[PDB]
């Protein structure tokens, strides 16, 4: 079926639950074995989410090269994407190693650090210009720039240097700072605004690495902002946008990393955006 008449007939019959449960029956199941291992918990946010071993991201180290972090793989969309987990005290080094690797331009952070009262990720960037960071296990420094506050989100210029070979790279953060402690946002309209930006700036373009998206998980939040994306991406590039199916897209890109979209509302919201951004594109 068409997405927004699917969507009208999933909510006059109210069966939004029974879809959600119906993409969690079907999604593949591959080994996390890496994850698991008992010297890599320290390494890991929850228990239950964890990378597959196929499509987990190496760090270029011989000790441990574990991070919690997937690559997913868009084949006809072309575009990839780096899903992971807010950084935890011990792996704010590993992180921006990845980062570096990888050759990304931009991070996109979907969470505030403190939510519902509690920690949902590290301080793992510098809040002043005169007060740097600097990893000692990865032997990276991080600058702050600059920075720019708008009313949803805020936009921070970095610089990262390899202090092995003092090579410099600047890296956009791109902070969606609204999202609410509980549920979803009523309207897609500031999300939509928020992946716009991250478009116009260069950081989901060929010519770099991929885009490392994070919430606390990287699996909810994350996986609407990857979803909507690609949906929009292909509505373009078909003859048929209508042929967009996102149910089919959403377990595509669950063959990469489990888990992507929480809840029946994550799930909700997603068709919302992508309907609301296909009228805007053109
Ligand atoms: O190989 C790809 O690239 C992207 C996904 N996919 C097939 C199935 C679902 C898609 O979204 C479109 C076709």
Same mark, same amino acid.
């Given at each position: 079926?068409?997405?927004?008449?699917?969507?009208?007939?999933?909510?006059?019959?109210?069966?939004?639950?029974?879809?959600?449960?119906?993409?969690?029956?079907?999604?593949?199941?591959?080994?996390?074995?890496?994850?698991?291992?008992?010297?890599?918990?320290?390494?890991?946010?929850?228990?239950?989410?964890?990378?597959?071993? =196929?499509?987990?991201?190496?760090?270029?180290?011989?000790?441990?090269?574990? /991070?919690?972090?997937?690559?997913?793989?868009?084949?006809?969309?072309?575009?990839?994407?780096?899903?992971?987990?807010?950084?935890?005290?011990?792996?704010?080094?590993?992180?921006?190693?990845?980062?570096?690797?990888?050759?990304?331009?931009?991070?996109?952070?979907?969470?505030?650090?403190?939510?519902?009262?509690?920690?949902?990720?590290?301080?793992?960037?510098?809040?002043?210009?005169?007060?740097?960071?600097?990893?000692?296990?990865?032997?990276?420094?991080?600058?702050?720039?600059?920075?720019?506050?708008?009313?949803?989100?805020?936009?921070?210029?970095?610089?990262?240097?390899?202090?092995?070979?003092?090579?410099?790279?600047?890296?956009? =953060?791109? =902070?969606?700072?609204?999202?609410?402690?509980?549920?979803?946002?009523?309207?897609?309209?500031?999300?939509?605004?928020?992946?716009?930006?991250?478009?116009?700036?260069?950081?989901?373009?060929?010519? =770099?690495?991929?885009?490392?998206?994070?919430?606390?998980?990287?699996?909810?939040?994350?996986?609407?902002?990857?979803?909507?994306?690609?949906?929009?991406?292909?509505?373009?590039?078909?003859?048929?946008?209508?042929?967009?199916? /996102?149910?089919?897209?959403?377990?595509?890109?669950?063959?990469?990393?489990?888990?992507?979209?929480?809840?029946?509302?994550?799930?909700?919201?997603?068709?919302?955006?992508?309907?609301?951004?296909?009228?805007?594109?053109?």
């Amino acid at each position: 079926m068409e997405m927004e008449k699917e969507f009208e007939q999933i909510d006059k019959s109210g069966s939004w639950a029974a879809i959600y449960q119906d993409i969690r029956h079907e999604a593949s199941d591959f080994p996390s074995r890496v994850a698991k291992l008992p010297k890599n918990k320290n390494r890991n946010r929850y228990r239950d989410v964890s990378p597959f071993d =196929h499509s987990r991201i190496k760090l270029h180290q011989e000790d441990n090269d574990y /991070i919690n972090a997937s690559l997913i793989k868009m084949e006809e969309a072309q575009r990839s994407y780096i899903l992971t987990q807010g950084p935890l005290p011990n792996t704010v080094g590993h992180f921006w190693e990845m980062v570096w690797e990888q050759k990304s331009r931009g991070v996109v952070m979907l969470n505030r650090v403190m939510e519902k009262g509690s920690l949902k990720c590290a301080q793992y960037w510098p809040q002043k210009e005169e007060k740097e960071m600097i990893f000692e296990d990865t032997n990276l420094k991080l600058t702050l720039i600059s920075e720019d506050i708008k009313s949803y989100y805020t936009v921070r210029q970095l610089e990262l240097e390899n202090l092995t070979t003092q090579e410099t790279r600047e890296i956009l =953060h791109f =902070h969606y700072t609204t999202w609410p402690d509980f549920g979803v946002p009523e309207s897609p309209a500031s999300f939509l605004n928020f992946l716009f930006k991250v478009r116009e700036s260069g950081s989901l373009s060929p010519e =770099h690495g991929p885009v490392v998206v994070h919430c606390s998980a990287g699996i909810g939040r994350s996986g609407t902002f990857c979803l909507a994306d690609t949906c929009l991406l292909l509505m373009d590039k078909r003859k048929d946008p209508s042929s967009v199916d /996102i149910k089919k897209v959403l377990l595509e890109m669950r063959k990469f990393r489990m888990g992507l979209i929480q809840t029946a509302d994550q799930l909700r919201f997603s068709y919302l955006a992508v309907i609301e951004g296909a009228k805007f594109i053109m």
